[PDB]
Design a protein around this ligand. Structure first.
Ligand SMILES: NC(=[NH2+])NCCC[C@H](N)C(=O)O
Ligand SMILES: O=S([O-])[O-]
Ligand SMILES: O=S([O-])[O-]
Ligand SMILES: O=S([O-])[O-]
Ligand SMILES: O=S([O-])[O-]
Ligand SMILES: O=S([O-])[O-]
Ligand SMILES: O=S([O-])[O-]
Ligand SMILES: [Zn+2]
Ligand SMILES: [Zn+2]
Ligand SMILES: [Zn+2]
Ligand SMILES: [Zn+2]
Ligand SMILES: [Zn+2]
Ligand SMILES: [Zn+2]
Length: 270
């Protein structure tokens, strides 16, 4: 393992630990890096966003092919290492939490995504304008992203992915491709924005999917009551909601949109 050795050499050169966070797993196989890049069709005109460059193995490959790369890294020591170890003309390193910082404009994402931020990063991405995202997640998370309405793992993530994106698992990635080796496989995921998006009210979606096992009427009565309004105000309106015979985890985007329009009509959503 050429690149695994390079990892050990760099780690010890700067005397740094393999992880700043329990879920840090460096991508250390060149063919997986190149597969991600080729899946994304990275070319000389692309502006790329990466999150968590680590010791910069994917960043390096991106920089050779892309017009510009923005890479977001929380750890200042990692950043110092990237700056000393590489010579790129076309990489802007953004210090901070990728979930919290403002993103530059980009047309593509090519990134390994730490599991700890997989969910908030993906919700943020789905709300941005991009042409294509090729990202690596833990396999179970990727399977959540492509779950179908009514499956056990269909969640708010699944709904928004279906509503806003076209998502494909391109392949599994073995745990052998990272150091340290994770306990589970990863997956390479391709995301493109839907041309005809189903744009859903985020507060409604969160309210419904708080307790996704609940019936649609119960989920709404409970969530709206907890906002601070009397049950008496909303009981009859909620009892006549469309798709009331479903549990929330069975709802298609199209059905959530119906609920939203009904709720706006009845003064429950502003
Ligand atoms: N495994 C893959 N490369 N799948 C490619 C999907 C391409 C995508 N649906 C598009 O509209 O461009
Ligand atoms: O701790 S690693 O398996 O995300
Ligand atoms: O090509 S990278 O090593 O600056
Ligand atoms: O493909 S998993 O079994 O490493
Ligand atoms: O996309 S919103 O539901 O976080
Ligand atoms: O909260 S009021 O509408 O009874
Ligand atoms: O069933 S809803 O799309 O009218
Ligand atoms: Zn980091
Ligand atoms: Zn190469
Ligand atoms: Zn689980
Ligand atoms: Zn619950
Ligand atoms: Zn009460
Ligand atoms: Zn329905």
């Amino acid at each position: 393992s050429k690149m695994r050795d390079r990892l050990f050499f760099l780690l010890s050169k700067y005397g740094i630990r393999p992880r700043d966070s329990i879920g840090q797993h460096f991508l250390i196989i060149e063919d997986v890096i190149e597969k991600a890049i080729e899946t994304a069709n990275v070319n000389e005109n692309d502006v790329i966003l990466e999150v968590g460059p680590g010791l910069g193995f994917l960043t390096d490959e991106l920089a050779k092919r892309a017009k510009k790369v923005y890479t977001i890294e929380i750890d200042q020591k990692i950043i110092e290492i990237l700056k000393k170890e590489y010579s790129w003309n076309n990489v802007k390193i953004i210090q901070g939490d990728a979930v919290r910082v403002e993103w530059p404009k980009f047309n593509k994402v090519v990134s390994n995504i730490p599991y700890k931020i997989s969910s908030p990063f993906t919700f943020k991405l789905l709300k941005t304008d991009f042409e294509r995202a090729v990202v690596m997640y833990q396999l179970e998370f990727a399977l959540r992203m492509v779950a179908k309405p009514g499956s056990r793992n269909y969640s708010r993530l699944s709904l928004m992915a279906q509503a806003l994106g076209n998502v494909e698992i391109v392949m599994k990635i073995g745990k052998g491709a990272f150091y340290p080796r994770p306990k589970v496989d990863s997956a390479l995921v391709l995301i493109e924005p839907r041309k005809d998006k189903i744009v859903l009210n985020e507060n409604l979606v969160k309210a419904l999917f708080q307790h996704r096992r609940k019936t649609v009427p119960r989920a709404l009565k409970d969530s709206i009551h907890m906002l601070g309004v009397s049950k008496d105000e909303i009981r009859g309106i909620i009892n006549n909601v469309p798709h009331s015979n479903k549990r929330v985890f069975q709802l298609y985007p199209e059905e959530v949109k119906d609920i939203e329009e009904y709720l706006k009509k009845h003064g429950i959503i502003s």
